[PDB]
């Protein structure tokens, strides 16, 4: 019944998950899963992020977690890796962005063609629902203005009557490279990495890792998977870890790393191999 404070700066949910996951890994309780596709993908992402990680094996990954065992070091070495792995498990994000871009163009085709600014566009539907929230959270100058310019170019080839279905099919066929670029920004841009995430936004990844995230003591007694128990606060998530596990598998080494969550994510400042 020990509350472990996770760091606020960066991807706060990912910091707490990294601490909880490290306990399950180092205790051996996930050993049966380490050869499954989810843990092979985690290993691949750990190696891609850490150039001094070698050889590429779960032995080396456990060695890194045991050497860099202060919880603040664990966040720095593992939270960026989990953030990158999560992006591989967003099977419905392409459809979501296509639907956002479809709503934008369908409700604002003439506005866009006429050179109107982002604030002048209809962004709310007939039920008061947000029509393109992920697009409107992109950077106004660097992303949203170039998006409107790009849509003006693309719409020159629009040769159908204006209906939502026609817009969606047109964008599916003719805006593939734009849609791919928007997915990268929404997945990994500055705002993407420090906005604040729900646990449901990590479900694809945690499902692949055979883990259930339990938020605020709301437990599924029919779920027999390994559980990481979390508490949600402001500028902080907490991980719950039993006292025996925390004494053995966390904070067993002095803190060794001295970089910010953002420098760790960008990844240029390499972590030294043990």
Residue-by-residue DSSP string for 127-181:
TS-BS-HHHHTS-IIIIIHHHHHHHHHHHTT--S---HHHHHHHHHHH-HHHHHH
**Apex 205 CA angle, 86 and 230, nearest 5:** 95
Residue-by-residue DSSP string for 26-60:
HTTTTGGGTTSHHHHHHHHHHHHH-TT--S-SHHH
Give dist(CA 145, CA 157) in Å, integer. 20
List all residues 6 or more positions away from 87 whose beta carbon is below 8 Å from its beta carbon.
Answer: 187, 188
How far CA 219 is from CA of 50, 92, 253, in Å, comes to 35, 26, 32
Token pair, residue 69, equals 């065992």
SS3 for 232? strand
Token pair, residue 31, equals 């050993």
Element (H, E) at 240: strand 236-241
Give the pairing of strands 211-215 and 226-233.
parallel
Give dist(CA 133, CA 83) in Å, integer. 21
Experimental method: X-ray
Per the CB < 8 A criterion, the answer to whether 16 and 235 are in contact is no
Give dist(CA 235, CA 223) in Å, integer. 29
Per the CB < 8 A criterion, the answer to whether 104 and 135 are in contact is yes
Token pair, residue 60, equals 């080396």
- Resolution in angstroms for this experimental structure? 1.5
């Amino acid at each position: 019944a020990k509350t472990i404070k996770a760091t606020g700066d960066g991807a706060c949910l990912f910091n707490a998950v990294s601490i909880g996951l490290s306990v399950e890994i180092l205790s051996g309780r996930l050993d049966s899963q380490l050869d499954t596709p989810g843990y092979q993908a985690l290993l691949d992402e750990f190696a891609k992020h850490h150039p001094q990680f070698n050889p590429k094996s779960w032995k080396t990954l456990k060695e890194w977690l045991a050497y860099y065992n202060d919880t603040r070091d664990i966040e720095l070495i593992l939270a960026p890796v989990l953030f990158n792995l999560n992006q591989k498990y967003q099977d419905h994000l392409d459809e979501e962005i296509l639907n956002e871009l479809t709503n934008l163009v369908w409700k604002n085709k003439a506005n866009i063609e006429n050179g109107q600014a982002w604030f002048q566009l209809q962004n709310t539907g007939d039920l008061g629902e947000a029509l393109f929230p992920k697009l409107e959270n992109l950077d106004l100058k660097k992303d949203r203005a170039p998006l409107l310019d790009k849509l003006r170019e693309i719409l020159k080839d629009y040769k159908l009557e204006l209906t939502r279905e026609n817009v969606k099919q047109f964008l599916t066929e003719k805006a593939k490279e734009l849609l791919s670029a928007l997915k990268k920004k929404i997945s990994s841009d500055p705002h993407a990495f420090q906005r604040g995430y729900s646990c449901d936004e990590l479900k694809g990844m945690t499902d692949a890792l055979a883990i259930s995230l339990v938020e605020n003591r709301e437990e599924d007694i029919t779920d027999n998977r390994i559980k990481i128990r979390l508490e949600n606060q402001e500028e902080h998530w907490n991980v719950l870890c039993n006292e025996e596990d925390s004494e053995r598998f966390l904070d067993s080494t002095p803190s060794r790393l001295k970089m910010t969550s953002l420098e760790a994510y960008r990844g240029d400042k390499q972590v030294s191999a043990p």
